[PDB]
Curated annotation (Swiss-Prot):
Reported function: Cytoplasmic dynein 1 acts as a motor for the intracellular retrograde motility of vesicles and organelles along microtubules. Dynein has ATPase activity; the force-producing power stroke is thought to occur on release of ADP. Plays a role in mitotic spindle assembly and metaphase plate congression.
Family in the record: Belongs to the dynein heavy chain family.
Illness: Charcot-Marie-Tooth disease, axonal, type 2O: An axonal form of Charcot-Marie-Tooth disease, a disorder of the peripheral nervous system, characterized by progressive weakness and atrophy, initially of the peroneal muscles and later of the distal muscles of the arms. Charcot-Marie-Tooth disease is classified in two main groups on the basis of electrophysiologic properties and histopathology: primary peripheral demyelinating neuropathies (designated CMT1 when they are dominantly inherited) and primary peripheral axonal neuropathies (CMT2). Cortical dysplasia, complex, with other brain malformations 13: An autosomal dominant disorder characterized by global developmental delay with impaired intellectual development. Some patients show signs of peripheral neuropathy, such as abnormal gait and hyporeflexia. CDCBM13 is associated with variable neuronal migration defects resulting in cortical malformations.
Protein's recorded name: Cytoplasmic dynein 1 heavy chain 1
Domain of life, source organism: Eukaryota
Native source species: Homo sapiens (Human)
Domain notes: Dynein heavy chains probably consist of an N-terminal stem (which binds cargo and interacts with other dynein components), and the head or motor domain. The motor contains six tandemly-linked AAA domains in the head, which form a ring. A stalk-like structure (formed by two of the coiled coil domains) protrudes between AAA 4 and AAA 5 and terminates in a microtubule-binding site. A seventh domain may also contribute to this ring; it is not clear whether the N-terminus or the C-terminus forms this extra domain.
Subcellular location: Cytoplasm, Cytoskeleton
Chain positions with N6-acetyllysine modification: 8
Length: 93
């Protein structure tokens, strides 16, 4: 059946989507500290230079660590907020 080949082709995307849905509780529980970092950056850090921005972000993250706040560490700031479409549109500009 053509449907069999279709579904077996779609099995990989099914696995992707189920794996994504599995960890939704951890995807959601960390919005607090992550948004704290991101909002502090989007408020203050626009005046500072690269070194000062990095220092200030590091201080925020360390304070969140001290306070037992759930936040992702490996997610980069632009990759955290800006998506692919915004990045590509800006690069086109």
């Amino acid at each position: 059946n053509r449907s069999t080949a279709l579904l077996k082709s779609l099995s990989a995307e099914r696995e992707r989507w189920e794996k994504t849905s599995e960890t939704f509780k951890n995807q959601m529980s960390t919005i607090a500290g992550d948004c704290l970092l991101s909002a502090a950056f989007i408020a203050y850090a626009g005046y500072f230079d690269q070194q000062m921005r990095q220092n200030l972000f590091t201080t925020w993250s360390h304070h969140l660590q001290q306070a037992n706040i759930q936040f992702r560490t490996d997610i980069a700031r632009t990759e955290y907020l800006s998506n692919a479409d915004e990045r590509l549109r800006w690069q086109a500009s």
